[PDB]
Coordinates of C-alpha atoms in Angstrom, one line a residue:
Chain A
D1 CA -4.6 -5.1 -37.3
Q2 CA -7.9 -4.4 -35.7
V3 CA -8.5 -5.3 -32.0
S4 CA -12.2 -5.9 -31.1
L5 CA -13.0 -4.0 -28.0
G6 CA -15.7 -4.0 -25.3
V7 CA -16.2 -1.0 -22.9
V8 CA -17.5 -1.8 -19.3
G9 CA -19.1 1.0 -17.4
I10 CA -20.8 3.6 -19.6
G11 CA -20.7 6.6 -17.3
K12 CA -19.8 10.2 -18.2
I13 CA -16.0 9.4 -18.6
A14 CA -16.8 6.6 -21.0
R15 CA -19.2 8.7 -23.1
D16 CA -17.2 11.9 -23.0
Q17 CA -13.6 10.5 -23.4
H18 CA -13.4 6.8 -24.1
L19 CA -16.0 6.3 -26.8
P20 CA -14.9 9.4 -28.8
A21 CA -11.2 8.2 -28.6
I22 CA -12.0 4.6 -29.5
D23 CA -14.2 5.7 -32.5
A24 CA -11.3 7.8 -33.8
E25 CA -8.7 5.0 -33.4
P26 CA -8.5 2.7 -36.5
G27 CA -6.7 -0.1 -34.5
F28 CA -9.9 -0.8 -32.5
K29 CA -13.4 -1.9 -33.4
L30 CA -15.9 -1.0 -30.8
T31 CA -18.0 -4.2 -30.5
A32 CA -19.8 -4.4 -27.2
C33 CA -20.7 -2.3 -24.1
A34 CA -21.9 -3.2 -20.7
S35 CA -23.7 -0.9 -18.3
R36 CA -27.0 -0.6 -16.4
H37 CA -27.8 2.7 -18.0
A38 CA -29.0 3.6 -21.5
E39 CA -28.3 1.3 -24.4
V40 CA -25.4 2.4 -26.5
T41 CA -26.2 2.8 -30.2
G42 CA -24.3 0.8 -32.8
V43 CA -22.9 -1.9 -30.6
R44 CA -24.1 -5.1 -28.8
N45 CA -25.3 -4.1 -25.3
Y46 CA -25.2 -6.0 -22.0
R47 CA -26.2 -5.1 -18.5
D48 CA -23.2 -6.7 -16.8
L49 CA -19.8 -8.0 -17.7
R50 CA -20.6 -11.6 -17.1
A51 CA -23.3 -11.5 -19.9
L52 CA -21.0 -9.6 -22.2
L53 CA -18.2 -12.2 -21.8
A54 CA -20.6 -15.1 -22.2
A55 CA -21.9 -13.7 -25.5
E56 CA -18.7 -12.2 -26.9
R57 CA -16.2 -15.1 -27.0
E58 CA -14.2 -13.8 -29.9
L59 CA -13.8 -10.3 -28.4
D60 CA -10.1 -9.4 -28.0
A61 CA -10.1 -6.7 -25.3
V62 CA -12.1 -4.8 -22.7
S63 CA -11.6 -1.3 -21.3
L64 CA -12.9 -0.8 -17.7
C65 CA -14.4 2.5 -16.9
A66 CA -16.6 1.8 -13.9
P67 CA -15.8 2.9 -10.4
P68 CA -12.7 1.4 -8.8
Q69 CA -14.6 -0.6 -6.2
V70 CA -15.8 -3.0 -8.9
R71 CA -12.6 -3.0 -10.9
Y72 CA -11.0 -6.1 -9.5
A73 CA -13.9 -8.4 -10.0
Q74 CA -14.4 -7.1 -13.6
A75 CA -10.7 -7.3 -14.5
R76 CA -10.4 -10.8 -13.0
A77 CA -13.4 -12.0 -15.0
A78 CA -12.1 -10.5 -18.2
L79 CA -8.6 -12.0 -17.8
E80 CA -10.1 -15.4 -16.8
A81 CA -12.2 -15.2 -20.0
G82 CA -9.1 -14.5 -22.1
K83 CA -9.4 -10.8 -22.8
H84 CA -6.7 -8.1 -22.7
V85 CA -7.6 -5.5 -20.1
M86 CA -7.3 -1.7 -19.9
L87 CA -8.0 -0.1 -16.5
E88 CA -9.1 3.4 -15.7
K89 CA -7.3 4.9 -12.8
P90 CA -6.9 4.1 -10.0
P91 CA -6.1 0.6 -11.2
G92 CA -7.8 -0.9 -8.1
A93 CA -9.3 -0.1 -4.8
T94 CA -6.3 -1.8 -3.1
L95 CA -2.7 -2.6 -4.0
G96 CA -3.0 -6.3 -3.5
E97 CA -5.7 -6.6 -6.1
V98 CA -3.6 -4.9 -8.8
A99 CA -0.6 -7.2 -8.0
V100 CA -2.9 -10.3 -8.4
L101 CA -4.3 -9.0 -11.7
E102 CA -0.8 -8.3 -13.1
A103 CA 0.3 -11.8 -12.1
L104 CA -2.8 -13.4 -13.6
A105 CA -2.4 -11.4 -16.9
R106 CA 1.3 -12.4 -17.1
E107 CA 0.5 -16.1 -16.5
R108 CA -2.2 -16.1 -19.2
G109 CA -0.2 -14.1 -21.7
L110 CA -2.6 -11.2 -21.8
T111 CA -2.0 -7.4 -21.8
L112 CA -2.9 -5.5 -18.6
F113 CA -2.7 -1.8 -18.8
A114 CA -3.1 0.4 -15.7
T115 CA -3.8 3.8 -17.3
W116 CA -3.0 7.2 -15.9
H117 CA -4.6 9.7 -18.3
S118 CA -2.8 12.7 -16.9
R119 CA 0.6 11.1 -17.7
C120 CA -0.4 11.6 -21.4
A121 CA -0.9 15.4 -21.0
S122 CA 1.3 17.3 -23.4
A123 CA 3.6 18.9 -20.8
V124 CA 4.6 15.6 -19.1
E125 CA 7.2 14.2 -21.5
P126 CA 8.9 17.6 -22.1
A127 CA 9.0 18.1 -18.3
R128 CA 10.4 14.6 -17.7
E129 CA 13.2 15.1 -20.2
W130 CA 14.1 18.6 -18.9
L131 CA 14.2 17.4 -15.3
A132 CA 16.2 14.2 -16.0
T133 CA 19.7 15.7 -15.8
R134 CA 19.1 18.7 -13.5
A135 CA 19.5 19.4 -9.8
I136 CA 16.1 19.6 -8.2
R137 CA 15.5 21.7 -5.1
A138 CA 11.8 21.4 -4.2
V139 CA 8.4 20.4 -5.7
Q140 CA 5.1 22.0 -4.9
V141 CA 1.7 20.5 -6.0
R142 CA -1.6 22.5 -5.8
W143 CA -4.6 20.6 -7.0
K144 CA -7.8 22.4 -6.0
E145 CA -11.2 22.3 -7.6
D146 CA -14.8 22.5 -6.4
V147 CA -16.1 18.9 -6.2
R148 CA -19.6 20.2 -6.9
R149 CA -18.5 21.7 -10.2
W150 CA -16.2 19.0 -11.4
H151 CA -17.9 15.8 -10.0
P152 CA -21.5 16.9 -9.6
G153 CA -23.8 14.2 -8.2
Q154 CA -21.1 11.5 -7.9
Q155 CA -21.3 9.2 -4.9
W156 CA -18.7 6.4 -5.3
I157 CA -16.1 9.1 -4.5
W158 CA -17.4 9.2 -1.0
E159 CA -17.6 5.5 -0.3
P160 CA -14.9 3.2 1.0
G161 CA -12.3 2.7 -1.8
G162 CA -13.5 5.8 -3.6
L163 CA -10.4 8.0 -2.8
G164 CA -12.3 11.2 -2.2
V165 CA -10.1 14.1 -3.2
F166 CA -7.4 11.6 -4.1
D167 CA -9.5 10.9 -7.2
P168 CA -8.1 14.0 -8.9
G169 CA -5.1 14.1 -6.6
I170 CA -3.8 10.8 -7.9
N171 CA -3.7 12.4 -11.3
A172 CA -1.2 14.9 -10.0
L173 CA 0.7 12.1 -8.3
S174 CA 0.8 10.2 -11.6
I175 CA 2.4 13.2 -13.3
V176 CA 4.9 13.9 -10.4
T177 CA 6.1 10.2 -10.3
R178 CA 6.6 10.3 -14.1
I179 CA 8.5 13.5 -14.3
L180 CA 10.7 13.2 -11.2
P181 CA 13.8 10.9 -11.5
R182 CA 13.7 9.5 -8.0
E183 CA 11.2 7.7 -5.8
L184 CA 9.1 9.5 -3.1
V185 CA 8.7 8.7 0.6
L186 CA 5.7 10.0 2.5
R187 CA 6.8 11.7 5.7
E188 CA 3.5 13.1 6.9
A189 CA 0.0 13.5 5.7
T190 CA -3.2 15.1 7.0
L191 CA -6.6 14.0 5.7
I192 CA -9.7 16.2 6.2
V193 CA -12.8 14.0 6.3
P194 CA -16.4 15.3 6.4
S195 CA -18.5 13.5 9.0
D196 CA -21.0 12.1 6.4
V197 CA -18.4 10.6 4.0
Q198 CA -15.7 7.9 4.2
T199 CA -13.0 9.6 2.1
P200 CA -11.1 12.9 2.4
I201 CA -12.3 16.2 0.9
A202 CA -8.9 17.8 1.4
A203 CA -5.4 16.5 2.1
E204 CA -1.8 17.7 2.6
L205 CA 1.2 15.4 1.8
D206 CA 4.8 16.1 2.9
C207 CA 7.1 13.8 0.9
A208 CA 10.8 13.6 0.2
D209 CA 12.6 12.0 -2.7
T210 CA 15.6 9.7 -2.1
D211 CA 17.9 12.7 -2.3
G212 CA 16.0 14.5 0.3
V213 CA 14.2 16.9 -2.1
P214 CA 11.0 18.1 -0.3
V215 CA 7.9 17.3 -2.3
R216 CA 4.7 19.0 -0.9
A217 CA 1.2 18.6 -2.1
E218 CA -2.2 20.3 -1.3
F219 CA -5.4 18.7 -2.6
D220 CA -8.7 20.4 -1.9
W221 CA -12.2 19.7 -3.1
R222 CA -13.9 22.4 -1.0
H223 CA -15.2 25.6 -2.5
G224 CA -12.3 28.1 -2.6
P225 CA -11.2 31.3 -4.4
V226 CA -9.2 29.5 -7.0
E227 CA -9.3 26.3 -9.1
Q228 CA -5.8 25.2 -10.1
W229 CA -4.0 22.1 -11.2
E230 CA -0.3 23.0 -10.8
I231 CA 3.0 21.3 -10.3
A232 CA 6.1 23.5 -9.7
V233 CA 9.6 22.1 -9.6
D234 CA 12.4 24.4 -8.4
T235 CA 15.8 23.7 -9.9
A236 CA 19.2 25.3 -10.1
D237 CA 18.2 26.2 -13.7
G238 CA 14.9 27.9 -12.9
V239 CA 11.4 26.8 -12.1
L240 CA 9.5 24.3 -14.2
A241 CA 5.8 25.1 -14.0
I242 CA 3.1 22.6 -15.1
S243 CA -0.4 24.0 -15.0
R244 CA -3.8 23.3 -16.5
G245 CA -3.4 19.7 -15.3
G246 CA -0.5 19.1 -17.7
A247 CA -1.8 21.1 -20.7
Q248 CA 0.4 24.1 -20.0
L249 CA 4.2 24.4 -19.3
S250 CA 6.7 27.1 -18.6
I251 CA 10.4 26.6 -18.0
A252 CA 12.6 29.2 -16.3
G253 CA 9.7 31.7 -16.9
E254 CA 9.4 30.9 -20.6
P255 CA 6.3 29.3 -22.1
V256 CA 6.9 26.0 -23.9
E257 CA 4.9 25.1 -27.0
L258 CA 3.1 21.8 -26.6
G259 CA 1.3 19.4 -28.8
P260 CA -2.5 19.4 -28.5
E261 CA -4.2 17.6 -25.7
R262 CA -5.1 14.0 -26.6
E263 CA -4.9 12.1 -23.4
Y264 CA -7.3 9.3 -24.2
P265 CA -6.3 9.0 -27.8
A266 CA -2.7 8.5 -26.5
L267 CA -3.9 5.9 -24.0
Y268 CA -5.7 3.8 -26.6
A269 CA -2.8 4.1 -29.0
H270 CA -0.5 2.7 -26.2
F271 CA -3.0 -0.1 -25.3
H272 CA -3.0 -1.2 -29.0
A273 CA 0.8 -1.2 -29.0
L274 CA 1.1 -3.1 -25.8
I275 CA -1.3 -5.8 -27.2
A276 CA 0.7 -5.8 -30.4
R277 CA 4.0 -6.4 -28.6
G278 CA 2.7 -8.9 -26.0
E279 CA 3.4 -6.5 -23.1
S280 CA 1.8 -5.1 -20.0
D281 CA 2.1 -1.7 -18.3
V282 CA 1.2 -1.6 -14.6
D283 CA 2.7 1.3 -12.7
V284 CA 1.1 1.4 -9.2
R285 CA 3.4 3.9 -7.7
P286 CA 0.8 6.7 -7.7
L287 CA -1.6 4.4 -5.9
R288 CA 1.0 3.2 -3.4
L289 CA 1.6 6.9 -2.4
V290 CA -2.2 7.3 -1.8
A291 CA -2.3 4.0 0.2
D292 CA 0.6 5.4 2.3
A293 CA -1.4 8.6 2.9
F294 CA -4.4 6.6 4.1
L295 CA -2.2 4.3 6.2
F296 CA 0.0 7.0 7.8
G297 CA -2.1 10.2 7.5
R298 CA -3.6 12.0 10.5
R299 CA -7.4 12.2 10.1
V300 CA -9.3 15.4 11.0
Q301 CA -13.1 15.4 11.0
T302 CA -14.9 18.3 9.5
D303 CA -18.5 19.3 8.9
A304 CA -20.8 17.2 6.8
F305 CA -20.5 17.7 3.0
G306 CA -24.2 17.1 2.2
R307 CA -24.9 14.2 -0.1
Chain B
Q1 CA 31.1 -12.5 15.1
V2 CA 28.8 -9.7 13.8
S3 CA 29.1 -6.6 16.0
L4 CA 25.6 -5.4 16.7
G5 CA 23.9 -2.2 17.9
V6 CA 20.3 -2.2 19.2
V7 CA 18.3 0.9 18.7
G8 CA 15.3 1.6 20.9
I9 CA 15.5 -0.1 24.3
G10 CA 11.9 -0.6 25.4
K11 CA 10.4 -3.6 27.1
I12 CA 10.4 -5.8 23.9
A13 CA 14.1 -5.0 23.5
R14 CA 14.8 -5.7 27.1
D15 CA 12.7 -8.8 27.3
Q16 CA 13.1 -10.4 23.8
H17 CA 15.9 -8.9 21.8
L18 CA 18.7 -8.6 24.3
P19 CA 18.2 -12.1 25.7
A20 CA 18.1 -13.6 22.2
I21 CA 21.2 -11.7 21.2
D22 CA 23.2 -12.5 24.3
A23 CA 22.4 -16.2 23.8
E24 CA 23.6 -16.1 20.1
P25 CA 27.4 -16.2 19.8
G26 CA 27.1 -15.2 16.1
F27 CA 26.6 -11.6 17.4
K28 CA 28.5 -9.5 19.8
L29 CA 26.3 -6.9 21.4
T30 CA 28.4 -3.7 21.2
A31 CA 26.3 -0.6 21.5
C32 CA 22.7 0.5 22.4
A33 CA 20.9 3.7 21.7
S34 CA 17.9 4.9 23.7
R35 CA 16.8 8.1 25.4
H36 CA 15.8 6.0 28.5
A37 CA 18.2 4.3 31.0
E38 CA 21.7 3.2 30.1
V39 CA 22.1 -0.5 29.3
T40 CA 24.8 -2.3 31.3
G41 CA 27.9 -3.8 29.8
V42 CA 27.7 -2.1 26.4
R43 CA 28.5 1.4 25.1
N44 CA 25.4 3.5 25.4
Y45 CA 24.1 6.4 23.3
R46 CA 21.0 8.6 23.5
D47 CA 20.3 8.5 19.7
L48 CA 21.4 6.6 16.6
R49 CA 23.2 9.5 15.1
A50 CA 25.6 9.6 18.0
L51 CA 25.9 5.8 18.0
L52 CA 26.8 5.7 14.3
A53 CA 29.4 8.5 14.7
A54 CA 31.1 6.7 17.6
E55 CA 30.9 3.1 16.3
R56 CA 32.4 3.2 12.8
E57 CA 33.6 -0.4 13.0
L58 CA 30.1 -1.6 13.9
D59 CA 28.7 -4.2 11.5
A60 CA 24.9 -4.2 12.0
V61 CA 22.0 -2.6 13.8
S62 CA 18.7 -3.9 15.0
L63 CA 15.9 -1.3 15.1
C64 CA 13.3 -1.9 17.9
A65 CA 11.7 1.6 18.2
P66 CA 8.2 2.5 17.0
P67 CA 7.6 2.2 13.3
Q68 CA 7.1 6.0 12.9
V69 CA 10.8 6.6 13.4
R70 CA 12.1 3.5 11.5
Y71 CA 12.6 5.0 8.1
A72 CA 14.9 7.8 9.3
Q73 CA 16.8 5.3 11.5
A74 CA 17.2 2.6 8.9
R75 CA 18.2 5.1 6.2
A76 CA 20.9 6.6 8.5
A77 CA 22.2 3.2 9.3
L78 CA 22.4 2.1 5.7
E79 CA 24.0 5.4 4.7
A80 CA 26.6 4.7 7.4
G81 CA 27.3 1.2 5.9
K82 CA 25.5 -1.0 8.5
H83 CA 23.3 -4.1 7.9
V84 CA 19.8 -3.4 9.2
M85 CA 17.3 -5.6 11.0
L86 CA 13.8 -4.1 11.3
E87 CA 11.1 -4.9 13.9
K88 CA 7.7 -5.2 12.4
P89 CA 6.1 -3.4 10.7
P90 CA 9.1 -2.6 8.6
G91 CA 7.9 0.9 8.0
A92 CA 5.0 3.3 8.6
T93 CA 4.4 3.2 4.8
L94 CA 5.2 0.9 1.9
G95 CA 7.1 3.5 -0.1
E96 CA 9.7 3.9 2.7
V97 CA 10.3 0.1 2.8
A98 CA 10.8 0.0 -1.0
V99 CA 13.3 2.9 -0.8
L100 CA 15.2 1.2 2.0
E101 CA 15.4 -2.1 0.1
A102 CA 16.7 -0.4 -3.0
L103 CA 19.2 1.6 -1.0
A104 CA 20.4 -1.6 0.8
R105 CA 20.8 -3.4 -2.5
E106 CA 22.7 -0.5 -4.1
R107 CA 25.1 -0.4 -1.2
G108 CA 25.5 -4.2 -0.9
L109 CA 24.0 -4.3 2.6
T110 CA 21.6 -6.7 4.3
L111 CA 18.1 -5.4 5.0
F112 CA 15.8 -7.8 7.0
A113 CA 12.2 -7.0 7.5
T114 CA 11.3 -9.3 10.5
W115 CA 8.0 -10.9 11.4
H116 CA 8.6 -12.5 14.8
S117 CA 5.3 -14.5 14.5
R118 CA 6.4 -16.2 11.3
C119 CA 9.0 -17.9 13.5
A120 CA 6.5 -19.4 15.9
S121 CA 6.9 -23.1 16.0
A122 CA 3.5 -24.0 14.3
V123 CA 4.2 -21.9 11.2
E124 CA 6.5 -24.1 9.1
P125 CA 4.7 -27.4 9.8
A126 CA 1.4 -25.7 8.9
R127 CA 2.9 -24.3 5.7
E128 CA 4.2 -27.6 4.6
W129 CA 0.9 -29.4 5.3
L130 CA -1.1 -26.8 3.4
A131 CA 1.3 -26.6 0.4
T132 CA -0.4 -29.4 -1.6
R133 CA -3.9 -29.4 -0.2
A134 CA -7.3 -28.2 -1.2
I135 CA -8.2 -25.3 1.1
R136 CA -11.8 -24.3 1.6
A137 CA -11.8 -21.4 4.1
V138 CA -9.7 -19.6 6.7
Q139 CA -10.8 -17.9 9.9
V140 CA -8.5 -15.7 12.1
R141 CA -9.4 -14.6 15.6
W142 CA -6.8 -12.3 17.2
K143 CA -8.3 -10.7 20.4
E144 CA -6.6 -9.4 23.4
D145 CA -7.0 -6.7 26.0
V146 CA -4.7 -3.8 25.0
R147 CA -4.4 -2.6 28.6
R148 CA -3.0 -6.0 29.5
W149 CA -0.6 -6.6 26.7
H150 CA 0.5 -3.1 25.7
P151 CA 0.0 -1.1 28.9
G152 CA 0.8 2.6 28.8
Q153 CA 1.8 2.6 25.1
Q154 CA 0.9 5.7 23.1
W155 CA 2.6 5.2 19.6
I156 CA 0.0 2.6 18.9
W157 CA -2.7 5.3 18.9
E158 CA -0.8 7.8 16.7
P159 CA -0.8 8.1 12.9
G160 CA 1.2 5.2 11.5
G161 CA 1.0 3.2 14.7
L162 CA -1.5 0.6 13.4
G163 CA -3.7 0.3 16.5
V164 CA -5.1 -3.2 16.7
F165 CA -3.2 -4.0 13.5
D166 CA 0.0 -4.0 15.7
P167 CA -0.9 -7.5 16.9
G168 CA -3.2 -8.1 13.9
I169 CA -0.3 -7.9 11.4
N170 CA 1.4 -10.7 13.3
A171 CA -1.6 -12.9 12.4
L172 CA -1.4 -11.7 8.9
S173 CA 2.3 -12.5 8.8
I174 CA 1.5 -16.1 9.7
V175 CA -1.4 -16.3 7.3
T176 CA 0.6 -15.0 4.3
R177 CA 3.4 -17.5 5.1
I178 CA 1.3 -20.6 5.6
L179 CA -1.1 -20.1 2.6
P180 CA 0.2 -20.9 -0.9
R181 CA -1.7 -18.2 -2.8
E182 CA -1.9 -14.4 -2.5
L183 CA -4.7 -12.6 -0.7
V184 CA -7.0 -9.8 -2.0
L185 CA -8.9 -7.6 0.4
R186 CA -12.6 -7.4 -0.5
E187 CA -14.0 -5.6 2.5
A188 CA -12.8 -4.2 5.8
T189 CA -14.4 -2.4 8.7
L190 CA -12.2 -0.4 11.2
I191 CA -13.6 0.7 14.6
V192 CA -11.8 3.8 15.8
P193 CA -12.2 5.3 19.3
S194 CA -12.9 9.0 19.1
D195 CA -9.7 9.9 21.0
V196 CA -7.2 7.9 18.9
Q197 CA -6.1 7.8 15.3
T198 CA -5.9 4.0 14.7
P199 CA -8.5 1.2 15.0
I200 CA -9.2 -0.7 18.2
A201 CA -11.0 -3.4 16.3
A202 CA -11.3 -4.5 12.7
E203 CA -12.8 -7.1 10.5
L204 CA -11.2 -8.2 7.2
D205 CA -12.9 -10.1 4.4
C206 CA -10.3 -11.4 2.0
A207 CA -10.1 -14.0 -0.8
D208 CA -7.1 -15.9 -2.1
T209 CA -6.5 -16.1 -5.9
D210 CA -8.6 -19.4 -6.0
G211 CA -11.5 -17.6 -4.4
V212 CA -11.0 -19.1 -0.9
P213 CA -12.6 -16.9 1.7
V214 CA -10.2 -15.6 4.4
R215 CA -11.9 -13.8 7.2
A216 CA -10.2 -12.1 10.2
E217 CA -11.4 -10.5 13.4
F218 CA -9.0 -8.3 15.4
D219 CA -10.1 -6.7 18.7
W220 CA -8.2 -4.9 21.4
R221 CA -11.3 -4.2 23.6
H222 CA -11.9 -5.9 26.9
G223 CA -13.8 -9.1 26.3
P224 CA -14.7 -12.5 27.7
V225 CA -12.0 -14.3 25.8
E226 CA -8.4 -13.7 24.7
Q227 CA -7.4 -15.8 21.7
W228 CA -4.8 -15.9 19.0
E229 CA -6.1 -18.5 16.5
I230 CA -5.9 -19.3 12.8
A231 CA -8.1 -22.1 11.5
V232 CA -7.8 -23.4 7.9
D233 CA -10.5 -25.7 6.7
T234 CA -9.4 -28.2 4.0
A235 CA -10.7 -31.4 2.3
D236 CA -8.4 -33.3 4.7
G237 CA -9.7 -31.6 7.9
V238 CA -9.1 -28.5 9.9
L239 CA -5.6 -27.1 10.6
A240 CA -5.8 -25.1 13.8
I241 CA -3.1 -22.8 15.0
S242 CA -3.6 -21.4 18.5
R243 CA -1.6 -19.6 21.2
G244 CA -0.3 -17.2 18.6
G245 CA 1.5 -20.0 16.8
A246 CA 2.8 -22.0 19.8
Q247 CA 0.2 -24.8 19.4
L248 CA -1.0 -26.8 16.4
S249 CA -3.6 -29.4 15.6
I250 CA -4.2 -31.0 12.2
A251 CA -7.4 -33.0 11.5
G252 CA -8.2 -33.1 15.2
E253 CA -4.8 -34.5 16.2
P254 CA -2.2 -32.5 18.1
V255 CA 1.2 -31.9 16.4
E256 CA 4.5 -31.9 18.2
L257 CA 6.4 -28.6 17.8
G258 CA 9.9 -27.4 18.5
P259 CA 10.7 -24.9 21.2
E260 CA 9.1 -21.5 21.0
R261 CA 12.1 -19.2 20.1
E262 CA 10.8 -16.5 17.8
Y263 CA 13.6 -13.9 18.4
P264 CA 16.4 -16.4 18.6
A265 CA 15.2 -17.6 15.2
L266 CA 15.1 -14.1 13.8
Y267 CA 18.6 -13.3 14.9
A268 CA 19.9 -16.6 13.5
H269 CA 18.3 -15.7 10.2
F270 CA 19.7 -12.2 10.2
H271 CA 23.2 -13.6 10.7
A272 CA 22.6 -16.0 7.8
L273 CA 21.4 -13.2 5.5
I274 CA 24.5 -11.2 6.3
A275 CA 26.7 -14.2 5.8
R276 CA 25.2 -14.9 2.4
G277 CA 25.0 -11.3 1.3
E278 CA 21.2 -11.3 1.0
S279 CA 18.2 -9.3 2.0
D280 CA 14.8 -10.5 3.2
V281 CA 12.0 -7.9 2.8
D282 CA 8.5 -9.3 2.6
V283 CA 6.1 -6.5 2.8
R284 CA 2.9 -8.4 2.0
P285 CA 1.6 -8.3 5.6
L286 CA 2.0 -4.5 5.6
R287 CA 0.5 -4.2 2.1
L288 CA -2.7 -6.0 3.4
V289 CA -2.9 -3.6 6.3
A290 CA -2.4 -0.7 3.9
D291 CA -5.2 -2.0 1.8
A292 CA -7.4 -2.2 5.0
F293 CA -6.6 1.4 5.8
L294 CA -7.2 2.5 2.2
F295 CA -10.4 0.5 1.4
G296 CA -11.9 -0.1 4.9
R297 CA -15.0 1.5 6.2
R298 CA -14.4 3.5 9.4
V299 CA -16.8 3.5 12.3
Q300 CA -16.3 5.8 15.3
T301 CA -16.6 4.3 18.8
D302 CA -16.4 5.7 22.4
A303 CA -13.2 7.1 23.7
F304 CA -10.5 4.7 24.8
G305 CA -9.0 6.8 27.5
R306 CA -5.3 7.4 27.4

């Protein structure tokens, strides 16, 4: 059962991750693309989503890969036009817009899928199963990378709604909220904001789950001595250590063998299954935690980043 | 009679909560907790922990302190088996309110996130008039001198204290009650004095799910005019709420209202929720403010002076 698919926003994530994953998934037929960049070979091309929707009435689904600040208008137009919708993360620039999109999709009988690619990393499900029945003592997240190495020349990240360092940091939060059994409350946050941008370049979160387990997180996009994408969960049965952003796992000091990394193949497989079953999948809890940090966090100005 | 403790005895507690409680025979004011002066005629405590330990029979608590301490207080009260009424905003974050609601539901206790402005007398007549009408646009103007209306307050300037969204969320609580469809924030601008953490002025550009534009201007700076107005343009004329919800006109004609009794109405509703075994936790006004802090552009302005 082939689902015809359009991709909206042909940036580097689309070309590097989405198009290769789609082209390797038999359940989808890549039919159309929309962007203002180079024409994509082998599909029908459009420069905006309005033109794509007007010319592709039979199209089944769209996958949205553009920056989050345009996500609501695009997803709304796609749902109004009768298409199933897959969202890159974060699923919106605000929480209200995601709630409205979910309600609209449910009313129209269409699949809406808020994706979290890091939740499909190979360590996540083994970690979730190991932690389900165990006494958890503390969680530490360290998510540090040089923005100039990992997001060279990107500007939407610095604009209102662009998350700054919570762009990678929400990936860590999407893993934490999937592997931990209880919900998190933000007790304190500090956001470090360069004077020439609108979003933080570094942040610290102090959270607690509903049993009082301390959950601390450090996100940093400044140049530093180490790049690391680590989540450590201390338990009465030893430390569970996720590293390499979810691609590496050790439990009580022992490495755990994992399946190969296939985050975006797993996302598209799940999108196809959601469509097939008439279901949606919209978990906004990672975005709610980020919203709480922007609402409750203390802001500290720092020197200009240089854009 | 529901035995009631009040937590946080500042001037809103002294001027609004206690008079409303004392005039409502459905409650018996039993205990107060505050680090400030003792309250006369009740048992007094310096903190909620001591109150809970000494008042095991107590039925309910009403939390009136700043929102930055409300989660720890409400959680302790729910863990102690008390029904809980929250001043607005119901938390400093959305996650804490979701956790409190789930805890209350698991324990079989009433949790009530109050919005005093939703009980202003214009609100229900405005909601009923707008329910079946074609709306074209909404304008909110909520402007007051902070030094007049919140003199000497500091929590408003600290992280989680909302700044001008302290009164502004009252306007949003009215708008989200009178309008039939949900709102999406499209743009916000927050003006933040260099010596505080929260905005002193803000503009919001929203749209409802039919595309109706909903614009709001909030300002705490000294200005020529103080105003607390919501105007809804419709195919059948303008609905105009003024005086914070204490005055209403529809299509150019004044509308008779009942007495302005926001806090009496809140406590009556809390009593009814307890009696019916229900909770009432609408966080949509806070979600809109969260969206403004997450998506809004921030502009520094001159120091406020505190």
